[PDB]
Design brief:
This is part of a larger assembly, with three copies of chain A. By secondary structure, chain A is an alpha/beta fold. Chain A is 25% helix and 25% strand. It is classed as ligase.
């Protein structure tokens, strides 16, 4: 719970950024023996032990030792070091130590198809890599300058620490490369710099309070840049941090009871597994807030979750009172925008947000772009682009894609959107899921979700574009198509004989454009 | 020259940039039936002729024709189209027509080694490529979706123009890729955006900082982005532009004499060739100004050059007066920074600059940087850094090399510099050419040049460094080494007995660090 | 001469500005026992002494004593306090003390007519004033809350220092008011803020483009903001600063010899004075530089001055070599702009600049304006306007005059000017000294100087405009006039029989427009 003079120290520091938060604590003089970092014991120190409570002074010691090691391995400023692991606190140590040399840690998800994570790191020009034990086979034997593991770091390497350590980053210096989840092919490498990764957070501190975000459970996937942002944010406030590596509901609920977090960060999948779960054994009364990154959680799970714990609210006497329940925030962002431009807040009994994502944070700028890049009048549909001082400088060694994903000065998120008269935004669909048909624009994913919510006979479905030759009828095209549903029935469900009339009856009841034909698929 | 009403109009145009200069001249209602662009005859118009005097409307005709063609081949915004030719006019036509679709023309020097040009285009992810007939062989039979030449483009494709043409560029949208044509290896690919490529000129224009450029001879190499900058800006200011492909001094001198330009744009190589030429026979009486946009020209050349022509200067009565001789400006530009970060002006009778390159223009800021990215006090030696809104956003598809050429927020020019008291910079040497020796820093090409300026016995020499295994003793290092010269004598020179002390005598008479051994080779 | 660790400190201080240099020095931990300020003994210290040389510790203690004094008189942030004195050291001590309470010290020239000095301080709404004993009666017994002198401030007042001292200026907070002096009409009160007054200096320090400033003799008038500006820059750079009150050449030469400056700061008429004494009796050897803020210095005087001393140039080995002579930089600044908008160096064997004044500093932007505020193209005459982060936010309590001196977003300097193709500016005249006339505009001052230089029989002359009642024919009028010259012959010289044709011989030869009549002026 940093004092108001401490918050003053942080905000007066022009040198503080995502590449030196640990060395800034040394400069502030933060207590060298208090425990600052909690782990799930998945990471082995140089000395061979698997600490579950790391002291600030111990963290200095671990980071210097990794730094000296990599300095001895030949790592200079602006080299790239892959980090392919499943340990979240192992991602963390290598992040800081590789940073402290002016080198760029490149996070890769441990469950990447082994030939993909070989070509993903290769394309970046990495000098070498570090893995956990089970991923070491994925890179060893390749053409990397080295491939190491925690075993290869020995206490003695701390003596190899170079002169003038640690590195002084420019705002613009790359301090991490990370990639996004839910990918099937070659992920896109997203660098973040000394300012971009902690910009949002530091804009918080510069005016608002730090609240009682005083015990952080980071159940974000370790390879995601969100997980280092919250970690160093938590190291800046003296709020302790637990680095949960498993995204499994039981595994996080366990770490909830052990650690007792006030705030919990995670993906939608993790939050689902905790909502669809017996919580009568579970303590859970320490949490005041969850944070979701990635795909928004489904409102069903949200309401189960916002039920436990207790939060501060604004008392009618303008003083703080603890109402019961917990706040669940859907951060809408990505690896690129390096935070959460949009924030949907859920609290007990709160209404459905529907398609509303609200308003961008002050520091960021959002527009509903037309095809020539100009923002549109409120009621009209176009590509959601954003600008932000949290935005990456662009995909690593892939300019061609980075500019394909920019329009009229903004970075295209992939979405189609619209505004109300007062400039709130409404998320419609992904732009490739939009079909230009005669009877309007069909938004495939809203269509699919309406049908499944309406027709429990269905197990899944896929709206699809059916067009003549050469007619371009997607969002950017000038032509018209026909929408088809491919209906996947659940086993033993009653199948109506007129599949098209049956589906279009649902659509019309909500005004949606009708499909042209519904077709059963073989599951 | 431009009236104040229509300079105001250009300055008032927030859309104007490097991806639509041609399209804004319409908006200004500039005439379509008068000549604006002169050529050397090396490019095939779609109708099969080789036009040498192009009107504005004809230029719209060629750009629209080419734009329909590339659009018909499936070129979309943000696609890359290689452009491998030796014609400056052919570079210009393709530049604007690929601009106009929102695609990214990638210039490549025609004299690149075929395996190199093939891989340089390949790595950018290009969709296609146009070439002159000589270079078709280099990119054909590959994976490029299409390799075509001027002959594949015909006046029918002018009707294939997509609806909504021409593209509306954002300031940040890429409008060209090109590479620096000094030095071999795999050359590094430099994009420029709609706003970077002309930033310096639009900024001077906004402050109305000027002088009538008159007729513009562009003898810059067509594949260099500077050739496109100067041409665009010439068009925008109503300057007749001549696109001269050959950098050979006599060929430029032919174009000078034929076209009679008020302003010449070139590279030091070409200027060295014109200055050491025989201008007794040459009519240079039209030239009022030369610009160099690359490496600095040798002051020896500049002084013969600035004795030709005439120029206007502010008279004692504050009216203009014509005086003999002309002005030569070094802009100390690169592909990365655009052609104008510094300016060194020279006029007849003016003083040597020595190694002073002066201060950067007001929109750029420069630094002499320590190894940890922090500007050094005047008198010290560090890495020249540049920040500028004229600067590229980074090497195409090569973020790794890009951040290796950046330090404390500046882009590294490759050079070691120092400042004096007034904050003028001085260029000392290229950073890899410095040798730390127990005796001081040896700038090996300052040492070569001093020796060859002093010892007529020498034909060439090569200073080089050697130390023990593991000793780091160049600029990136921390130890020391020994400087060695390798001497080459001209025929019939008397080779002194004590080579090393012969060499170190010249160096110690200027204050230079001595070498520890000189050897004939 | 300042270390790179202290330069880094300064360049990494977001709090540093004209309202707290002294306290930033304390924070940095500068030693308190070294001398940092040298005086001419004109200021009385609290203990009754007149310190000739002041340490850092003493400065702190003198400023705290004054700050607690003014806090007891009731002075609160944003109060204006007049400072009417001849002592430069007294301007300085009161300037820093009044700052440190967040109050605005307002300088006035001690030789100002007292009815004008009382009204200039009444218009600002001041709460009180401090004076030297000779001007106490100028403001005493009027409306001001208090009028005090140095006798009234005493060691005991240091104890009233307010809790939370010193004041934390926002960059946009006023830290001084002051005025210029060639003026008819009530002097315009010119405020500067925490960031305008020191901006140029801090700029040439973050880009390290300074040099050997060495020992600083400030012989600018104490009441001018540049005198505060230069002194605070000296403190930051750790450079002995001498506050010279008197502007008499005789008196500046005394101080040059005593204090041995390497850089001298001053105004034209001081430099003209030095350049005309018998300098052979004098030791100016320590000098390397003169800065002439404000007006332009006479070219013939500069020749005399740049002949003294030595400066240091870069040699063929790219190491410094000392050369005879010194550099004289003509700053063309005003109270509005801070003293450096244009450099203009003069070395031994410089060329005549003629009317050229070079280019502006990189932080400022300047243009030659047409009557509708549009930058004119090279070769045409217009008004000189300046935009700059060092510019004042506007005349204190007089918006009407402020906006009458702006055009197209530029502040009007009063000058007519012109540019060349490279964009160097040329000073033609002050706008009222220009006479509208057929066969062209007469720039009266240039016409005077041309004749004075071509006709040594003349001792002086005056070009002036005659036109009927109800015509304004200067630059801002639309009407026309006849130019007359009024010739003042030197003693006994031969008088031509066609004075009109005799001057229009030299005038038309140079291309200048011609006068209607020449006349004889006896003395």
């Amino acid at each position: 719970m940093i004092t108001k003079e401490e918050r003053a120290q942080i905000n007066a520091d022009p040198e503080l950024g995502a590449g030196n938060v640990l060395h800034r604590l040394r400069a502030y003089g933060r207590p060298t023996d208090r425990p600052v970092l909690w782990t799930d014991g998945t990471w082995r120190a140089p000395d061979g032990s698997h600490p579950e409570v790391i002291t600030l002074g111990e963290l200095y010691e671990y980071v210097e030792t990794y730094a000296g090691f990599y300095h001895g391995k030949g790592i200079r400023p602006r080299d790239v070091v892959g980090v392919l692991t499943a340990s979240s606190t192992e991602f963390a140590i290598n992040f800081m130590a590789i940073n402290s040399l002016g080198a760029i840690p490149s996070f890769a998800n441990a469950k990447l198809r082994p030939e993909i994570a070989r070509e993903y790191i290769r394309r970046q020009g990495a000098s070498g890599a570090v893995t956990d034990t089970e991923r070491h086979e994925v890179l060893a034997g390749g053409e990397l300058g080295f491939v190491v593991t925690a075993e290869d770091i020995r206490p003695e390497h701390r003596a190899q620490l170079p002169q003038g350590w640690p590195y002084r980053h420019d705002p613009t210096d790359p301090i991490i490369i990370s990639h996004s989840s839910g990918t099937t092919g070659m992920p896109k490498a997203v660098p973040h710099t000394h300012q971009t990764l902690l910009y949002a957070q530091l804009h918080r501190l510069k005016l608002s309070v730090g609240g009682s975000m005083g015990r952080l459970l980071v159940a974000l996937p370790g390879n995601h840049n969100a997980a280092m942002s919250v970690m160093m944010f938590g190291l800046l406030l003296d709020s302790p941090v637990y680095l949960q590596s498993s995204q499994r509901g039981s595994d996080v609920l366990d770490a909830i009871e052990k650690f007792k977090p006030t705030t919990v960060f995670g993906f939608s999948g993790t939050y689902g597994q905790i909502a669809t779960s017996d919580l009568s054994t579970r303590d859970m009364s320490s949490i005041e807030a969850y944070y979701n990154t990635g795909d928004a959680a489904h409102e069903a799970h949200i309401r189960v979750l916002v039920a436990q714990g207790s939060h501060e609210e604004i008392g009618p006497d303008f003083k703080p009172v603890r109402v019961p329940g917990s706040v669940f925030t859907d951060g809408l962002g990505s690896s690129e925008t390096g935070y959460s431009i949009f924030h949907n807040g859920h609290k007990p009994g709160s209404a459905s947000f529907g398609r509303c994502i609200g308003k961008p944070m002050s520091f960021a700028q959002a527009a509903v772009l037309s095809e020539d890049g100009r923002p549109l009048p409120a009621g009209e549909v176009g590509r959601l682009g954003v600008r932000s001082p949290t935005l990456t400088p662009g995909y690593w060694n892939d300019s061609l894609t980075w500019h394909k994903l920019r329009l009229g000065g903004y970075w295209l998120t992939g979405d189609l959107a619209m505004q109300d008269a007062e400039g709130n935004f409404y998320h419609l669909d992904r732009a490739p899921d939009a079909i230009r048909t005669e009877a309007g624009i069909v938004f495939s994913t809203r269509t699919e979700e309406l049908l499944l919510a309406s027709l429990p006979e269905l197990a899944d479905c896929t709206v699809t574009a059916i067009a003549e030759e050469g007619v371009r009828a997607d969002w950017d095209g000038d032509g018209v198509a026909e929408a088809y549903v491919l209906l996947q029935f659940t086993d033993g469900a009653r199948e109506p004989g007129d599949l098209t009339g049956w589906v279009n009856e649902v659509l019309a009841g909500q005004g949606f454009p009708p499909v042209t034909r519904a077709l059963r698929m073989d599951s």
